[PDB]
Amino acid sequence: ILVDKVFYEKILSVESFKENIITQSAIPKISNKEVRLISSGSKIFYAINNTSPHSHVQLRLNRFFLSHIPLNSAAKAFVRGGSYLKYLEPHIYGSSYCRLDISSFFNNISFDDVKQSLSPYIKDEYLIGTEQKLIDAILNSVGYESPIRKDKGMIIPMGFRTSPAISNIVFRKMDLLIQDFCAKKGVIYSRYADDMLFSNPRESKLLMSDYFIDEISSLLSIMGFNINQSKYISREKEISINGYVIENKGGNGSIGTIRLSKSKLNTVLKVTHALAQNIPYKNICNKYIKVRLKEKNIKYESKKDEFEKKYYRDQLINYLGGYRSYLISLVKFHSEYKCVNSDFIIQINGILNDIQNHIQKIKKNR
Amino acid sequence: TIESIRVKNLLSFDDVILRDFRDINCIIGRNNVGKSNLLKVIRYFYAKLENKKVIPLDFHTNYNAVGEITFTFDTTRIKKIVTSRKNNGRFHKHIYNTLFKSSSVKLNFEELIARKNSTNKSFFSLTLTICKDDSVMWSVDDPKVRSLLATLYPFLYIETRHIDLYDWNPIWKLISNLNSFNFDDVDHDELVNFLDEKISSRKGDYKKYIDRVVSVIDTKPYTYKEKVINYIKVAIKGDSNKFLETLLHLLITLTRTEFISPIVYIDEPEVGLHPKLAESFVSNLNKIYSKFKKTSELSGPGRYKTPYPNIFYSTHSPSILKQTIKLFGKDQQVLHFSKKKDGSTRVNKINSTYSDERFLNIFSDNEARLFFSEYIVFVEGATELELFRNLSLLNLYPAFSLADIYDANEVILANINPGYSKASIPFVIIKDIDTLIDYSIKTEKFSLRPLFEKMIKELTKEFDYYDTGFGRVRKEIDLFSDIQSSTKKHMDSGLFFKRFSLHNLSSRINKVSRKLNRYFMTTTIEGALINEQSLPYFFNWIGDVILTQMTINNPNPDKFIEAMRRRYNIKSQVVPLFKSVFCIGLNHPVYSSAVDKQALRIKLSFLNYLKRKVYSDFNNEKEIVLALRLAFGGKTETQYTLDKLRKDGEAELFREKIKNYKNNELFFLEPQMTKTSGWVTTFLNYTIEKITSEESDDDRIRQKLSFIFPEIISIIEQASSSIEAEESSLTG
Amino acid sequence: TIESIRVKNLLSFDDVILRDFRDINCIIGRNNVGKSNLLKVIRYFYAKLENKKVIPLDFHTNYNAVGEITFTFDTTRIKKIVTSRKNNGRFHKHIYNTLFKSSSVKLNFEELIARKNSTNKSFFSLTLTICKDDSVMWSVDDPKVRSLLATLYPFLYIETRHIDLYDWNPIWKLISNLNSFNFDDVDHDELVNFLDEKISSRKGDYKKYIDRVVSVIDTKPYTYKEKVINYIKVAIKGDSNKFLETLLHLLITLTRTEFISPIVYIDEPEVGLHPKLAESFVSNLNKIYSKFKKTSELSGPGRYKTPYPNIFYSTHSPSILKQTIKLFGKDQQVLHFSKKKDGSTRVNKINSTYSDERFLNIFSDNEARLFFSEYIVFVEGATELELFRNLSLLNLYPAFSLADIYDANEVILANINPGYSKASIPFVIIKDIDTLIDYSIKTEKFSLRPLFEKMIKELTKEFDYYDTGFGRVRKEIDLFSDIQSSTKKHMDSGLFFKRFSLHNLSSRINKVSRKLNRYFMTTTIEGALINEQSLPYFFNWIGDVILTQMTINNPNPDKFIEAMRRRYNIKSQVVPLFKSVFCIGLNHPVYSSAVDKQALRIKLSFLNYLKRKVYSDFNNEKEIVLALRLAFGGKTETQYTLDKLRKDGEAELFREKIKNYKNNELFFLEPQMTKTSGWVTTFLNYTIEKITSEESDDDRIRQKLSFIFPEIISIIEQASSSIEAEESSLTG
Amino acid sequence: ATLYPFLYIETRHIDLYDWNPIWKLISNLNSFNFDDVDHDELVNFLDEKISSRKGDYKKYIDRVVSVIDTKPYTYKEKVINYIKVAIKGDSNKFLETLLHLLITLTRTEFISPIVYIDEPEVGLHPKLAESFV
DNA sequence: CAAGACCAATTACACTCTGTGAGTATTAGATGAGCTAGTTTTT
């Protein structure tokens, strides 16, 4: 699609950035006080204020603009219809597996690459007089100057709602290059965010060789992306990715299988066992479900209290329903693609039956 | 025996996977481009299997550098054949040296012991990747494997629209490939000597002629295929629909003592064929399919247990599909292609197996027509068939004509199971409120039918977390549960409701059941036609009858009219005179000017008298609507019919009035006061003609129709919106 | 335009005549050779009209020295156009001189010419004679008449199966032949100068370029056709089903302002088309047909009263036929070709105009399938549809599988009117004996129904003479008239006849009505299914239903069975135990060996108990059959059902026995005692399977079926005999 | 490709019912701009000069176009149609005309094509081949 | 560290010279309430 001035007049800035358009006012950038800087580990998440024009502009961009730009089929994340199961599905046909991760994927995306990627889809015309164009007006609502990273340019925040679509759009040249390189050598390539999974069906040591890593690094160096050696995994006939086990016994066309290890399902089994042992709900959610009431309970306004029991009923029901949704998403993926172990299927059927029984018990108790 | 065909980023396929293939797989749909692209993909894959220089297929989008075609073969029969000890043959060893060799030598002495239980199935996957630089490579880098796969599972394409009768290339190819005889042991010299001995005026006369002919036409030696073709031609005594049927029979017969499993694709088998010819073709295919089948008690020579080759059809004729469903049964499937919103072919399996034998046996052209549809409206009743197939109404709405109206009860709906094919063939089930709730005058209480309780149970969203917006469903379910109270007072001898309104309940039920593709009307089908706003037009319709369908019986009209006037009073005895003068007659003779004026005056007087009597006997101006509704087999707001009211002994005075009008005043309309009498068609035609005469623009006509018929026009507009929402998908 | 086409002694036509051509003509039939030969005849006639050297057509038989092709043209509109004083152009005078001048000089102007100026129509007959020496003779000995007829009533043939999308020659030819503009007034030099002035600077460069091009090429000058085609191509902004629709639309649009009335013949308009596409094609044709109609009050700009060109369709699809019927009505006809006994093409008209608007709107694929049929079996009831469409029964009778069964009442039969096309489509109407004779229990009376009286009136040999071959028709009619009496008193409380037999009366009625294509059954279809000979098979079916229908309601079978045995007696209280243990269920779980043995013993005991009770309750092995018939909505020999007996009040004890059996003994079979319950299909399938298991050869199976089912096998064999007697004609 | 085009002429398998190379050369080898010319004025003039009253031919063309649903001509097709209208004309003669046209067109342009003629003497008298050369 | 491999999509001859691709040369019922929020991946 192509976005001209009139499109931005009443679609992406219908009400928010309207007063600036009429009164010959350049659209401002994002101020420091307009964002929060939350922390989790050694990671910084930029949270934009909900009541802000930039948030509305980002929502309209993600609904109308950043939803029609073509992407690469290897991008299985942040795309309507993409999923982790679809990210792991194509590798069932391979015998050798390799996993790579791009280090600081969102922080290493140069703003010039984003500008050059979004230029073909935005008309190169001035918006607010002969002061500001239309491309930079769109970009001002996407990026943010990070005080932590000094004056190194407009770094794409890791918490903005427009970040995933922009990342997938800008990582299309690299996706095409890597896909072509793997096609020339018979390697199946799939990317989820910044995890790249490569599968080789043939009996070769290409994925375990340093040449493959060197080629991937050389390709990624075009746009300035590196890969950390901490989580480089090269294995044969079996690979575990965050509990998802892909296993192929090998051959000349044998079909692999995808299952989930007991480590992935350990928490739900512990919860079900605790429910079987009639453990009180006080310590089944503050230990297993890592959900707990804060000290500032009942907003420091009510006096009835007693909300702890109903909270520990509600949140437990929600957790059981969500994990049930996860398991039945797995079984529907199996029905659609037929790449899941039968014993794992019967095991998750039994677990689903147990979860349904426990949900019925909890709802009867309330 | 393929089990999976996957196409990614080629032609019109983004990611399309085909599975659960059967013997008589049939392909239908308006997206002929999709069928052509699938056939091109299959032909390209099988050409690249045999190493033929062909143009690579185009990508669906250029933002992908890879185009994949994945074929999965069920190598279970072949593995069992080659694994057995008593199969020490060169070809058997060749098969168990390239396919089932890499997966056996690399395993220990435990894995294979679980593969001899005669219960597991073996799959062989082969992937063709087309790169951006027009370079094609395979998952397995062994041409022997590809050649063996092509030989074991060949692909045959038969085109009937462009078929040459003189050339029998597929027949001779099948004969040469499918044989169990070695022709290398035949001595050409011995055969020539035998021929010479057969025709010999002297010893050694044909030999010199043969030598001279060979010398004067000396060319390249015959190949094995040419030799076997010539031997078959001299061995046999003989060289559109008949050609294809013979080819299919030959292929089926040959594939009875061979482990080769061919794949047959036939495009448009019914071009230039009578429907009986297509039905006979499918019947002959089923006969040859069943003749070579042995099941338990069925045994003896001539019957085999060899799996049948997969046959693919591309048919636009409902006859072939109907016969395939009726005869084959569980050994067939129907694949609908259609398209997507952005433009991309889909493949969905349409329900073709029915658990009811009666439905399968009485399966007809309408049921096969439902599969060649883009929107099906399921109705219970022939009156709805009359109303929604009215030609005079469809021309004003050139979007509901694309929808097909089907009369089906609950059993037929369950057999068809439209929910299985929902994204391919959108459907709406139109029913009445009486199928959900029921009312009793003697016990003044609502009751819930099992259908409504089943729908509620289906809509109970248990085993669910908390999400925004999905909070009022539980409240609606609770309200639909608690409306079962007995507090509902009925006035007018149990005909109306004092405070309750079924309009709001019907609207709420429709709102909650929109997601289940069901629409429930407030009243019966006659309710939407006979309403208050339709009272004038309906009355005019009655007048039309009095002016059209009833003519003078006597051959001399003037004398009879004069005698009746001098004998019967024109004012007090007007009804007996009208009954004795006008009768039922299709012809409309033209009388004298005075006679015509007298007849018109009498008709106008009778119309005025009936209008005055109707307005005087009933005062509320609404009870007449209910009376007319119950006259034509309708229902009240209490969900009671005239017969049910008669059996329950309710509204005795109302039934007496209805009887008086039927047997005294509206006696000429008695034949039309029954269902399936065609009164709906006549009333709609007359109303539409009158509105067209009054209003000029078609938009005004549609607005007037919406005013007079709110529910019918609402349903039509909803169906039209549903069709136009997916117009770009269900259209070639 | 055209009235009659007569072919004598050419191709497959002996004395074939086609008449009564409408705006739309649909050609259907199983004899494609006849349609091809008719097309060849038309094309040869129109080629000889334009003086084209073509090979003469072959004679039907060489024992005839002459082959005639006769064409009659309705020269009424053109005669009125050329006769009018206002029109005095060169072409009008030429038309008057070459056609309407020879016939005018022979008629007196004072009287004959004045009389002929009325609503009467004028026709022009032209005959082409082919002799043995390949010589062509014409009725008119001047080429001018033939040339003017060719250029005034042109013939256009469109073949869709073999069509070129890149070729527009028919379209350009038609456009050039349908122009009323004189292109000779356009100056080439002025156009070239205008182009040169507005192409570039230095006026004259384009002129020099064109001069060089024409000096180098130097070909023959463009003809009028080429010049008008080029002018149209430049003037327009741009240039299978789409091409045909566009050509037809432009032809209809361009013929509104011209007196030329062409004849269009389209062969296979549905090749490679979805049924919806064919319906849309017919709908667009009807829309463009009705857009240019000016009749009655419909007037205004864009409306024309010119007659539409005749269009012929060679269709094998019911969709096109049904759309044509429903959309045109009186402006269409259906032609059936078939063959003769010795081999010769026929042309008959099948009824397509219906006086009932309800039938026209309801018209669907099932109704359109009757046109493409060789034998129709008309039945009243869905049970007969279930029986006659049974796949197992039709497998043993391949001949009856060629006949299609339609469910029609008397109104549908009257609308279809099968008697109009008897030779083209043979038919039989299967009805029950209660539509002829009426019986009452209260008063002994064999009343005659109006249908029977109508049949008697039709068979009354009034206005007739002697010399009747065989059959005392008058005696039979008299006996049928006097059968109305008060005899044949009741037996067993209005359930049988003391001495009267309905079998003989049914046989006599069938013998009389064989010529009426009507067959009347002795009893309803239930009586034909379950009779005194099929009781063992019905009992075996009941036993099989008991064995494989009910299961254990309790999840634990052994504990529940033990508890019920310890609670309920196994002999005296066997019925309560059976009711409380076995329940109807689709699933059939497998139990333990002891549980299975106990269940089998209980089922065998129940079967023995029911058999003993049936034998010891009813009198003989005749009341069981009547009881079972009335259970499944049947009739007795007095033409009474259970509902009618209840409304009357006869045979109260037998009704109580039936109620006791249904509510207590046979309660699992209660849901299957409805007409729309599918019990017929299940019973027929079980009987066929059992007979196949017992006997070996198919002839023995057919003999057993004839013994068990006399009436069904009799009617099937009669229909098969009729089909095989008239199979040569109704087969391509 | 557009500066050194390649042409192939097979005289043995040539067809006299089509002029594809000639029209291709005419469309590709031109120094004019068949874009200033507008369809409206062309039609208007044809209607004014054809017959009957004013606007009748324009209405005929409009009603033909509105019911045909055809994509507009490309530049090559449009210039081919214009040349066909502007001219008064439609084995050895065909080849000679093609070569003469190509030479005449290539005498005022910097495009230098390359022609390959296969079997220029099939079905020709020796005098005819000498006359061709 | 530093790196080859950096996506795809976005009918035409002006010129004085009418033939040439320079030469010049033209030329100018509004006031107690009172409430939570799924699994998993990226991270």
From Swiss-Prot, chain A:
A single GO molecular function term of this UniProt record: RNA-directed DNA polymerase activity
InterPro entries the record matches: DNA/RNA_pol_sf, GrpII_Intron_Splice-Mob/Def, Reverse_transcriptase_msDNA, RT_dom
Residue ranges constituting the Reverse transcriptase domain according to the UniProt record: 19-246
Example GO biological process: defense response to virus
EC number per UniProt: 2.7.7.49
Binding residue positions for Mg(2+): 101, 194-195
Pfam families referenced in this protein's UniProt entry, alphabetically: RVT_1 (PF00078)
Reactions this protein catalyses: DNA(n) + a 2'-deoxyribonucleoside 5'-triphosphate = DNA(n+1) + diphosphate
Top-level taxon of the source organism: Bacteria
Keywords for the protein's UniProt record, in alphabetical order: Antiviral defense, Magnesium, Metal-binding, Nucleotidyltransferase, RNA-binding, RNA-directed DNA polymerase, Transferase
Function: Reverse transcriptase (RT) component of antiviral defense system retron Eco8, composed of this RT, the following endonuclease and a non-coding RNA (ncRNA) encoded between them. Expression of retron Eco8 confers protection against bacteriophages T4, T6, T7 and SECphi4, SECphi6 and SECphi18. At multiplicity of infection (MOI) of 0.02 cultures slow growth when infected with SECphi4 but do not collapse, at MOI 2 cultures collapse. Responsible for synthesis of msDNA (a branched molecule with RNA linked by a 2',5'-phosphodiester bond to ssDNA).
Similarity remark: Belongs to the bacterial reverse transcriptase family.
Protein name according to UniProt: Retron Eco8 reverse transcriptase
UniProt source species: Escherichia coli
Swiss-Prot record, chains B, C:
Keywords: Antiviral defense, ATP-binding, Hydrolase, Metal-binding, Nuclease, Nucleotide-binding
Residue ranges, annotated region (Toprim domain): 373-686
Cofactor: a divalent metal cation
Segments of this protein annotated with the region Dimerization domain: 173-242
Entry-linked InterPro entries: ATPase_AAA_core, Bact_Antivir_Def_Nuclease, P-loop_NTPase
Keyword Metal-binding listed: yes
Free-text comment on the cofactor: Probably binds 2 metal cations.
GO molecular function, one term: ATP hydrolysis activity
Domain of life: Bacteria
Chain sites annotated for binding a divalent metal cation 2: 384, 605, 623
Amino-acid positions noted as binding a divalent metal cation 1 in the UniProt annotation, renumbered to this chain: 380, 432, 434
Taxonomic lineage of the native organism: Bacteria, Pseudomonadati, Pseudomonadota, Gammaproteobacteria, Enterobacterales
UniProt binding sites for ATP: 32-36
Region (ATPase domain N-terminus): 1-172
Similarity remark: Belongs to the class 1 OLD nuclease family.
Residue ranges of the region described as ATPase domain C-terminus: 243-372
Nucleotide-binding as UniProt keyword: yes
Name recorded for this polypeptide: Retron Eco8 OLD nuclease
EC number: 3.1.-.-
Pfam family, one: AAA_21
An example Gene Ontology biological process: defense response to virus
Quaternary structure note: Homodimer.
Biological function: Probable nuclease member of antiviral defense system retron Eco8, composed of an reverse transcriptase (RT), this nuclease and a non-coding RNA (ncRNA) encoded between them. Expression of retron Eco8 confers protection against bacteriophages T4, T6, T7 and SECphi4, SECphi6 and SECphi18. At multiplicity of infection (MOI) of 0.02 cultures slow growth when infected with SECphi4 but do not collapse, at MOI 2 cultures collapse. When the retron is cloned in another E.coli strain synthesizes msDNA (a branched RNA linked by a 2',5'-phosphodiester bond to a single-stranded DNA).
From Swiss-Prot, chain D:
Recorded superkingdom: Bacteria
Chain intervals for the UniProt region annotation (Dimerization domain): 24-93
Oligomeric and partner information: Homodimer.
Function: Probable nuclease member of antiviral defense system retron Eco8, composed of an reverse transcriptase (RT), this nuclease and a non-coding RNA (ncRNA) encoded between them. Expression of retron Eco8 confers protection against bacteriophages T4, T6, T7 and SECphi4, SECphi6 and SECphi18. At multiplicity of infection (MOI) of 0.02 cultures slow growth when infected with SECphi4 but do not collapse, at MOI 2 cultures collapse. When the retron is cloned in another E.coli strain synthesizes msDNA (a branched RNA linked by a 2',5'-phosphodiester bond to a single-stranded DNA).
Record-stated family: Belongs to the class 1 OLD nuclease family.
Protein name, entry field: Retron Eco8 OLD nuclease
Species of the source: Escherichia coli
Record gene name: old
Portion of the full-length sequence here: 151 to 300 of 750
